[PDB]
Amino acid sequence: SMSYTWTGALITPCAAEESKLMVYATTSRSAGLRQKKVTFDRLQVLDDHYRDVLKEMKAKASTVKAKLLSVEEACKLTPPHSAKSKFGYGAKDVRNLSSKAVNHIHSVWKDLLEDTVTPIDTTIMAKNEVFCVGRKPARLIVFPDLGVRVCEKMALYDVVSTLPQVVMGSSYGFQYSPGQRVEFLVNTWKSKKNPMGFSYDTRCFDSTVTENDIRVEESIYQCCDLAPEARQAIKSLTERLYIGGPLTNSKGQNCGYRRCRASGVLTTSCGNTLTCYLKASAACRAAKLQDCTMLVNGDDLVVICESAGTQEDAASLRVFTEAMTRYSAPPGDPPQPEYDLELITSCSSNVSVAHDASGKRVYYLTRDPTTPLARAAWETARHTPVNSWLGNIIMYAPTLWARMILMTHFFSILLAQEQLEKALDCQIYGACYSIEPLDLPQIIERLHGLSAFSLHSYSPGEINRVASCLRKLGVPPLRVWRHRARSVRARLLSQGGRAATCGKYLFNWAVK
């Protein structure tokens, strides 16, 4: 069946968009191009590898006990900036236990328990995301009303935050900080006698997800020891929301129908991860890959296994890809065998090596700096809710480009505007933090360790990537950033107290 059906009505914006300040932001203007790509018929033929893997997953899920969240708990865990309801209240009302919101949520719940069939309305919007140089169309976000979103948490918050790690164990990517992710990848790589590995990523994953896939996920969730009401709400949410439903634009017009994964529901990430893990594990068996270890984050997969030889590996990956295609998930680009861990990119990131103060080799997570640099450029001119600049400083603190360029420029701009002490909103790990730039050394030490302030002797490949990136984007080269940083450092040190702590830790690398 078709992943989508369209009426002709447009995906409209709900606010003023901006598609320029080179660096561009996606808008609703491109929605049609995206719609075209994500619209197709899914063919899926399952086999005994898929069935065997599924049985093993259910047996693990069957050891999980999950509870219902109360309305009040689900309200308190609602993110503060999520879209207001159509029924007269918003996130702030939900979070402060307003009677208007609570009573509507109780009524949505009762309807979920009493009606297990009627498709539930969703809004479809174009995502506004900043990229660098052709242009990629906007991604589509599909989400139901706030009152339903609270009810999803009631039924499934305890399940989605518990079950995946039990079912997928060490392969569940979302349990790891970056250093832990690196540690898993490196320890896995080093455990093989002749390691080979590859990243896989599905072309339009959400659209490849079938009704059967979504019901298989529900059947996994129902293997949990759940309360009777949970079982009913989960079934109802599955039939009425997860398998599909109608789409409405921001102007209240009917855009069409969805028969695939919604990107804006509580189960998107856990569901996608479970479903990719299931198809990928089955595909590894068809491919007959030896001593396979998987790492899964949504539909970004890394597989590390024992090499069978060059031509053998190349053919085994073609068989892997063939099986994934049969299960409904063809790749955006065909996977390639890699014999160097550093060359495997997944979740837009890769492992690299530097050295600590003692001269010990330290592995850390990095990425191509093009998109982070472009996003930071944008947030120099405009201003956003997410502050991707600051998030990247935190998540990629050990990297050469975050330390030399991102930290330098942003502490320079903060010195210049006297806004050192002003908290900024920052979206990291699904949650919205209010971060004080002077809190950064503690945040980085906690997340990465003290060595993040002392790494040096980076790999030549990574230094050159950063250098080619600066050159391509017209930004000063690294020698300029070292000079500027000595100036930023001297400045912070003059200010004493906590600013002197930022100069000491964040810019220890710039000293002679």
Q: Which residue numbers belong to the known binding site?
A: 201, 299-300
- Classify residue 439 by burial, with Cβ atoms within 10 Å: 0-12, 13-18, 19+: middle
- Four-residue CA torsion sign, 166, 171, 174, 180: positive
Among 152, 213, 217, 300, binds Mn ion (CB under 5 A): 300
208 vs 202: CA distance, rounded Å = 8
Encoded tokens for 58: 């259910």
Cβ distance to ligand CMF smaller for residue 308 or 475: 475
For strands 424-428 and 122-126, give the pairing. unpaired
Alpha helices in 382-423 (DSSP H): 388-395, 400-401, 408-417
Q: How far is CA 197 from CA 110, 194, 367, 379, in A?
A: 49, 10, 18, 36
500 vs 223: CA distance, rounded Å = 54
Contact characters 463-492, ligand CMF, x per CB under 6 A: ----------xxxx----------------
Which partner, Mn ion, ligand CMF, none, binds residue 300 by CB below 5 to 8 Å per kind? Mn ion
Segment interacting with ligand CMF, rule: CB under 6 A, options 133-141, 299-307, 374-382, 433-441: 374-382
Among 206, 213, 299, 313, binds Mn ion (CB under 5 A): 299
Which partner, ligand CMF, Mn ion, none, binds residue 346 by CB below 5 to 8 Å per kind? none
Which partner, ligand CMF, Mn ion, none, binds residue 476 by CB below 5 to 8 Å per kind? ligand CMF
Cβ distance to ligand CMF smaller for residue 23 or 302: 23
Q: Is 402 in the site for ligand CMF (CB under 6 A)?
A: no
Q: Which residues are annotated as a binding site for Mg(2+)?
A: 201, 299-300
CA angle 478, 403, 432 (to 5 degrees): 140
As a dihedral over the C-alpha atoms of residue 318, residue 319, residue 322, residue 323, rounded to 10 degrees, the angle is -150
Cβ distance to Mn ion smaller for residue 61 or 276: 276
User: Could you tell me which residues come within 8 angstroms of residue 487 by beta carbon, excluding any fewer than 6 positions away?
Assistant: 412
Segment interacting with ligand CMF, rule: CB under 6 A, options 288-296, 314-322, 375-383, 488-496: 375-383
Cβ distance to ligand CMF smaller for residue 196 or 440: 440
Shortest distance (Å) from residue 389 CB to ligand CMF:
7
Contact characters 3-32, ligand CMF, x per CB under 6 A: --------------------x---------
199 vs 320: CA distance, rounded Å = 12
DSSP E strands: which ranges in 316-360? Answer: 349-355
User: Could you tell me which residues come within 8 angstroms of residue 88 by beta carbon, excluding any fewer than 6 positions away?
Assistant: 100, 104
Residues 167-226 that bind Mn ion (CB under 5 A): 201-202, 205
244 vs 241: CA distance, rounded Å = 6
Shortest distance (Å) from residue 386 CB to Mn ion:
19
Shortest distance (Å) from residue 369 CB to ligand CMF:
8
Cβ distance to ligand CMF smaller for residue 377 or 510: 377
Among 373, 395, 402, 506, binds ligand CMF (CB under 6 A): 373
Among 101, 150, 304, 374, binds ligand CMF (CB under 6 A): 374
User: Could you tell me which residues come within 8 angstroms of residue 16 by beta carbon, excluding any fewer than 6 positions away?
Assistant: none
Determine how many CB atoms are found less than 10 A away from the CB of residue 291: 12
The residues of the shown chain that bind ligand CMF, judged by CB under 6 A, are 23, 373-374, 376-377, 380, 405-406, 409, 473-476
Instruction: Give the footprint of Mn ion on this chain (CB under 5 A).
Output: 201-202, 205, 299-300
